[PDB]
Design a protein around this ligand. Structure first.
Ligand SMILES: O=S(=O)(NCc1ccco1)c1ccccc1F
Lengths: 237, 300
């Protein structure tokens, strides 16, 4: 059934599973027309499909041409997401197909379920967690490749860089969500925090800085502080 | 006009014949039902004074033979049976009438309710849903489950309605995933009407028979099935004009006939609000919509 705080440790067993997030699939600036009406202009989007155990991220870039001459785009975006996920699954070898696909938003169950009818033994699950994957675009390396795209394109990343060489997937996923929640709540402060020290570089094949174990602790501390501050501002607590 | 005799009434029971129902006392001299109108199916059903669980009954068509009722004290229920000796059967019926031990099927001349509920219901189709081929008549009860219900346990006692599943390969063409899920006209017209049911009359008959079993026996899977077939039309953007007009009439008399106190379990809020207000056919059920609003505005 639904994924929540209790069964959280199942993300990290050896049953292959994928998180799918569709928040940045269909993206628009809203602007005024010459006549004073409101109109939208789409930009390139993406499907964020993540193995929480390995860090393998499958970034399906959704080029704006896909919406051309279509109506009800927000609804179609959901079906497009399920078509692209389902084709990812078909594309993978059998022993690599997921046993479970957990969607971040419940409106994707029916689309994915319909597209996955050929895979009856793959379970499509909702989640009660409020995961911050929509901040995946605050990530310049990903933002940049999305925006530059001239056609549809799959790009493969490890969203945990080399972290698993030193820490467990549980801990890596917790760091990842803490970084993304901070990016979501206050992007400016969050990116200030990671580059504060110009001597800590980003490897070309990495989207996080090469912190030592000790600097990650300090980093994670600073991100927790940031989130908590923002929250008091939000509610006046 | 045909007759169904009863050998005896040994236990206290409420007896229904179509939408009429009489209370019968333990060992009251009740010997059957007369003036039953020829030309429609019918249903005779029972609810024992002592066990208000398990409504049970028999569907039948008197053109298909002479039928009577007889209590069985071993199995504890009023059983339907066929009498093959024509002379022996007229003789029984005539003697009972002479003694006036029979109630009269109480039809009002102005009244087309029964016709309107059973328009497309045909005894041969019923006998394919309730497969018991040594009998010309069909038993149903509260507790029988549907073939689809069993898929998610005894086959001989199941109700073999046509399986409808909006999220199946059957309903969903590969490559038209979004299209067919949002607009079931493919599934309705090609798969169900043309492929399985063959015509709208058979579809409509199954729908009417589902409804009547949900209403008379409280058979829940029959209720699921009725709602499913309404939902399949209502969610199709392309439906023959004649079918839409006929559905409004069908549902109208179904909603008219439902006992007021049962709207809570027998009517599926989600299906009706979607059909009447969200679906492609939201504007095609004017009489159904008008009666639902003036009689059950709460559900909506
Ligand atoms: O693509 S990024 O991860 N986005 C922003 C960010 C915040 C902290 C570090 O990075 C990146 C930014 C700046 C220098 C290198 C990078 F890999």
């Amino acid at each position: 059934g639904a994924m929540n705080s209790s069964n959280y440790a199942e993300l990290f067993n050896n049953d292959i599973k994928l998180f799918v997030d569709d928040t940045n699939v269909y993206r628009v600036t809203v602007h005024k027309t010459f006549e004073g009406n409101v109109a939208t202009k789409a930009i390139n989007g993406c499907i964020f499909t993540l193995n929480p155990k390995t860090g393998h991220l499958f970034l399906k870039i959704i080029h704006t041409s896909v919406w051309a001459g279509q109506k009800r785009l927000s609804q179609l975006a959901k079906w497009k997401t399920a078509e692209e996920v389902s084709a990812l699954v078909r594309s993978l070898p059998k022993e690599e197909q997921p046993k479970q696909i957990i969607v971040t938003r419940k409106a994707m169950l029916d689309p994915l379920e319909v597209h996955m009818l050929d895979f009856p033994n793959i379970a499509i699950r909702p989640t009660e967690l409020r995961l911050p994957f929509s901040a995946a675009m605050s990530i310049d390396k990903l933002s940049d490749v999305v925006m530059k795209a001239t056609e549809p394109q799959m790009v493969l990343f490890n969203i945990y860089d080399d972290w698993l060489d030193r820490i467990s997937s549980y801990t890596a996923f917790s760091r990842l969500t803490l970084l993304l929640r901070a990016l979501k709540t206050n992007e400016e402060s969050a990116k200030m925090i990671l580059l504060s020290d110009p001597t800590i570089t980003i490897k070309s094949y990495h989207l996080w800085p090469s912190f030592t174990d000790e600097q990650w602790i300090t980093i994670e501390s600073q991100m927790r502080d940031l989130i908590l501050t923002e929250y008091g501002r939000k509610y006046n607590v | 006009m045909n007759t169904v005799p009863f050998t005896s009434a040994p236990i206290e029971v409420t007896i229904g014949i179509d939408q009429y129902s009489f209370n019968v006392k333990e060992n009251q001299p009740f010997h059957g039902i007369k003036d039953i109108p020829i030309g429609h199916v019918h249903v005779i059903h029972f609810q024992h004074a002592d066990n208000s669980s398990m409504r049970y009954g028999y569907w039948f068509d008197c053109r298909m033979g002479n039928f009577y009722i007889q209590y069985d004290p071993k199995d504890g229920l009023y059983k339907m049976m066929e009498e093959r000796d024509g002379a022996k059967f007229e003789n029984i019926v005539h003697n009972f009438k002479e003694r006036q031990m029979m109630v009269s099927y109480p039809k009002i001349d102005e009244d087309d309710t029964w016709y309107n509920l059973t328009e497309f219901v045909q005894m041969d189709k019923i006998r394919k849903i309730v497969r018991k081929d040594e009998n010309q008549f069909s038993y149903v009860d509260s507790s029988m489950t549907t073939v689809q219900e069993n898929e998610l346990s005894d086959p001989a006692h199941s109700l073999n309605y046509t399986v409808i599943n909006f999220k199946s390969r059957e309903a969903i063409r590969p490559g038209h995933e979004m299209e067919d899920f949002l607009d079931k006209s493919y599934y309705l017209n090609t798969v169900m009407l043309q492929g399985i049911f063959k015509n709208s009359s058979n579809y409509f008959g199954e729908l009417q028979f589902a409804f009547l079993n949900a209403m008379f026996f409280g058979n829940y899977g029959s209720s699921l099935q009725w709602h499913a077939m309404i939902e399949l039309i209502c969610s199709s953007a392309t439906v023959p004009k004649h079918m839409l007009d006929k559905l409004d009439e069908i549902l109208y008399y179904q909603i008219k006939t439902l006992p007021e106190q049962y709207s809570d379990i027998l009517l599926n809020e989600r299906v009706w609000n979607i059909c009447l207000y969200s679906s492609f056919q939201k504007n095609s059920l004017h009489n159904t919509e008008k009666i639902m609003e003036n009689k059950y505005p709460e559900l909506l």
